[model samples]
Target: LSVDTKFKTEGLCVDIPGIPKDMTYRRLISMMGFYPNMFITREEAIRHVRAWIGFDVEGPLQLGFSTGVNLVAVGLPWNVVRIKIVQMLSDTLKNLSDRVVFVLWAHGFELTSMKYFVKIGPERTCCLCDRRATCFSTASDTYACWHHSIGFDYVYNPFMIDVQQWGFTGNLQSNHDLYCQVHGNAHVASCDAIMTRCLAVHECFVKRVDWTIEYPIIGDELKINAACRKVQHMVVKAALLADKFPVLHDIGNPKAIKCVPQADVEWKFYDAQPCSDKAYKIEELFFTDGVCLFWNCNVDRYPANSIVCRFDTRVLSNLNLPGCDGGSLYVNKHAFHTPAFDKSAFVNLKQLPFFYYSDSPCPLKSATCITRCNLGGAVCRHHANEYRLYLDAYNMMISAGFSLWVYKQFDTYNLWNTF
Candidate 1:
């Protein structure tokens, strides 16, 4: 009686008048009046036949389950199957919702992080070079160090130690001549200028500040994070003094610095600090955690390999920098209150969905108020804006729907397993 009711009016099953009364679910769908012989197996039937009848070994008979798009590939380890099922179901729901069809997923599984074990370790030494005592030597040639004998010769490269040893006296002509000879004529004008500034900045930091004392003493080897912070500090200082030094600004800003606290491969996002008045010092703007600064996305901004700094507009103006205020917001999409790149003349301020420094204490306090004081400040401002866009609307809607579907499926499966 149940089977008859489902087939006649529910569109749950196709009736083949000559078929046996106890035929399987797959057979029932293939024999249905619609698309007869279109699908022959359970998987095939689910792929094309919507709302076609299907019966588990012990469960009640049910419809094809969705708009011919829903699927449940059961049987793998719960850990493996759950991920695949959830993704497929989520996509199916979106497809069905857009097309005015209905779709859902139901399956059972236990949660686990099961994996096939495999041993792994770091490479002990260089493949082509031999590290003997303090020197690295190639198979055919011996050198004092890797820097001296590697593909690129660092023997002539201008280094901080040499700059200090030579006792630089801030004479641009003398410095330029010395660096040019050592750097060779291989580099173009722009490259030469940038490299010169980088070396100069290196010298300035080593000479002007006792970084060895500024950074806390480590046991032996210098931590990568500590070294990176010191270098970044030098770069920022150089940039600020670039007008006078010219070479300082040529190094450009550092970009896409990521901080991953977790040991896993996944990268974690740090809310970058925007420029501000209260905290004007460069050290105050940057966070300290010895790690790596790989060229990666600015989690808060669109994406770039930009130096992360946040200096107030007033400070910039005081420094005589015109038109530059806000930092990069969405890659190149919109430049908000960036320094020296005044968008006021080009962009209609009120038209944008949100301003760069909207979330700051007083966004409209002044014409330059929207300029984030620094990179740290910008991080906060952009994070709030993204929350409103990505989480408040898009994520909330999809997350709620997906969560309910998964929860319901789990409950049903739990009951089935208990029985």
Candidate 2:
């Protein structure tokens, strides 16, 4: 969500910023993991790598995509999540060494220089069963396929299935993955259109009957008009909340149970004024009931109300959830409305003193800033970085369709690789 701090002076205070650990590397990885098999095209990968490293790369090559780089400029938080998933779920080196060699070449490296890297983080027990089977060990020379990792034990984590399912098909050439397809514009929009038309017709029929909200007016004009209006409302609501009902992360926060607006303020950019009696704002805190919830909390420089959601540490798995496409603390359309804020409340909006203005969507110079406390601007700047990363990922998706499939095939063997 987009935000700034002109409301604090008007007393429009909220905790809009989110913590880094919330958008874990594991979660995004799991979300995108399936795409290599279903969403990405092999041709795109070849094109990207060839252009990136400046070599006429040829490939029917098999290789694994490992996430290693520490610093990513644009998609900071999300890149962190993506890399961790690749590291943990990345294949063992020797089993797919040949395929990997080809990848190293595509990446402009000597084939022999392709070294194996193991995931380094908290030890994870098998998700299928809480069987503390093995620690991260290179010496074990042990490699397990997706199914084996999810052996028919008692425990069940969808992530295990998610990883395994995507692992095998990572090499496929198609745009069938859910998230990738959603962002692909053409495919998602097409499917959405069809579904919307069907729903409109269904609602039209449903309105003839009196099953939903009651309408007291019973005359011919009143009944017909009421039915039309009801159907229209339904269609609008459906379009807005389409993804969340079916667990789509694109429309809104995946894990948010509900949205509670803490303080709605009309603080214009850089107008740091504490909230007042008429402008008494409410701070909406998302209640997950202890389940892991993923909400975007990005603060812009403009003076606006601040919002922050809290999370429990126990809900977090060692690896952060991966594959989430885009997010925000505040939705853009409603960002500019309400409570005027002051300087003190505007500090939560900045993470770094200076961000590259060229990269920002609404150039920083043009964008006004607000914060909770001027002293706390540094911490708020970190929140700004998180927001920037989330936005960057969306921009990247728009620019670069989908790419995991090609990376997967070369990174690991297809179904037959396990044999």
Candidate 3:
């Protein structure tokens, strides 16, 4: 459900052929554990991003904004998710209840990290020229109110990225849209400048000092319960689906599954028998000799092409181990299944060699490439979507909490601006 915000149907310029085209929803649930350390990492837990940030993908990275988004969808703790979401939107809304409502609506739309903007006059005037109130202020020298400005026009309004990034050739007027619509050149550099400055004003004045989080109230309690129910449902769905699919039979069944404290493939279970009802104990395997151990467990670090094949092979038939019950197979225990991008059904599976490399020029060498390319593409898309869904869920939780906090703050400190 990626929203196409670009002018052309093709969308963003960064259409690297290595990525997948249409992704199945199943892809999102399949790969949750591969990037768990996101609490420390600012970038999406994609392996490709590790290269950009100059770090190995396996470390317990400190989390950032995008990480919080993925975490919420995975059914983790709501306390942090709620706090993070409110933290992100606190700058945008002036009131706690209003901000909560805004966040609730924001989830209805897909989220993106790109900044929003408009253009303005040369001598430091407000971007919105039609209304009054003056351009500069003590908080923000650029923003005032939109009544004074016309806003972005057709040429750039649809542009997903900043106006400057889009191919806009026009001398900017006091109104960014007017400048693009009336005069034509590409001095859009100021478009970004005006918008960014205005945003800063909202952030500085509204969220930081006004919002609070303290006592848990009744309304908040109900919202928290509902949110928790949603996450639990996802977790169950992820587990059940894994069992039904012959490919996911190993990871899906819980009873026979075992999570090793220090194994690279943290979870071990047999596909030969449904183990969903079995109790999972972490201490059994890893502590046999009375020692704690660990291994690299992130999904991105594992060989991508071999995963499905290896998983299926072990589930269908295999026995290199001494266990009497069944073969010893290592399925990841990250709490979520990787999206089932079944490559075996792919018609052009043999020719999709280009998919292995993210920078390959001819990744989709044929029509069959869709089938083979689906899994990888699905991985990225699922990550992006989950980031949006959970991020909002988190924010709503926090806003609900903070509203109570605001009331408490007002009651205790007796400050009228707590909201």
Best by lDDT: 1
Write the residue-wise lDDT of candidate 2 on 250-330 in tens digits: 112333222312212211122122111112222322221111111222122212212221111112111111111221011
lDDT of 1 by residue, 258-346 (tens): 23222223333433322211112223333222221212111222112123322223331111111211221111111122222222222
The runs of at least 3 residues in candidate 1 whose Cα sits more than 4 Å from the true structure, single-residue gaps closed, are 1-39, 49-381, 397-419
TM-scores for all candidates: the values are 0.16, 0.18, 0.16
Per-residue lDDT tens digits for candidate 3, residues 1-419, read 12222222112223223323443222311221111211111111111111111100101111122111222222434333333433342332111111011010011011122111112223232345432221222223444332221221201111111222223344223333331232222323222323222222122211112112222121344554464344333322222222221222123233432332222232334322221111222233211211111111111111211111112212211111011011121111111111111223222112211111111122223221222133345334433344455445544533432110000111111111111
Clashes of each: 37, 89, 36
Give the Cα lDDT of each candidate.
0.24, 0.22, 0.23
The alpha-carbon lDDT assigned to residue 243 of candidate 1 equals 17
Poorest stretch of ten by lDDT in candidate 1: 108-117
Candidate 2: worst 10 consecutive residues by lDDT? 402-411
